[PDB]
């Protein structure tokens, strides 16, 4: 529900071991590159 939505979102940002995934949105990268980077990072964590 609405709580679970907010939860996995906030938990994503605050995980100290998964900050690569958390900070693609801070990069001057195009959407397509950001999406391919998150896909790859999520495989190897």
């Amino acid at each position: 529900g609405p709580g679970s939505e907010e939860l996995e979102r906030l938990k994503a940002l605050l995980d100290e071991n998964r900050q690569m995934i958390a900070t693609v949105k801070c990069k001057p990268w195009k959407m397509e590159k950001k999406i391919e980077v998150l896909k790859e990072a999520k495989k190897f964590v």
Partner: protein
């Protein structure tokens, strides 16, 4: 323009993120809240207070879920009856140019509902419930704050100090969304 001396406008521009032209605009907005209270001529530095109840009706604040606690934070007695200087201070912290760490300094105190100079689970539930504007019910807020408080508590004491809080909001900037108000 005879509302302020040149030295007054120099000081305002040097002590805030506003230019002199902005300061005159802020005086007009302050004056329009209560023309019987607010002098048009500030050159002798009059001391006047405009009640919180009027300030929180401005369109820039009236929808903010922390409007009362934000206005109170810039008042001497915590009642939010601001002088012009307080009013300018508050919109300078809230403006686009103000650094994250300045906003964070005030946000930490406004979110510290039990005034013990830490953010605990219960402070965070009261903060998130207001931030999410009825989108989340009571237990949905609990669900979120349960996970946030452990993740964010780096030191290990069950509560968030100011350093923990600043690291939190760097990763979750939506906690400072209520401190971005243009005027």
């Amino acid at each position: 323009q005879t509302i302020f001396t040149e030295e007054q406008l120099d000081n305002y521009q040097d002590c805030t993120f506003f230019n002199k032209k902005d300061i005159l605009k802020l005086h007009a907005r302050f004056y329009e809240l209560a023309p019987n209270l607010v002098p048009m001529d500030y050159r002798k530095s009059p001391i006047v207070h405009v009640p919180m109840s009027l300030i929180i009706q401005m369109p820039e604040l009236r929808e903010n879920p922390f409007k009362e606690r934000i206005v109170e934070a810039f008042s001497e007695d915590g009642e939010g009856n601001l002088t012009f200087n307080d009013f300018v201070d508050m919109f300078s912290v809230l403006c686009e140019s103000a650094p994250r760490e300045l906003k964070a300094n005030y946000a930490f105190k406004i979110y510290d509902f039990n005034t013990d100079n830490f953010i605990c689970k219960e402070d965070l539930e009261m903060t998130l419930a207001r931030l999410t504007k009825s989108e989340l019910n009571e237990d949905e807020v609990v669900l979120v704050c349960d996970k946030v408080i452990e993740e964010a508590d780096l030191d290990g004491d069950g509560k968030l100090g100011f350093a923990d809080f600043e690291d939190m909001i760097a990763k979750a900037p939506d906690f400072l969304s209520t401190f971005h108000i243009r005027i």
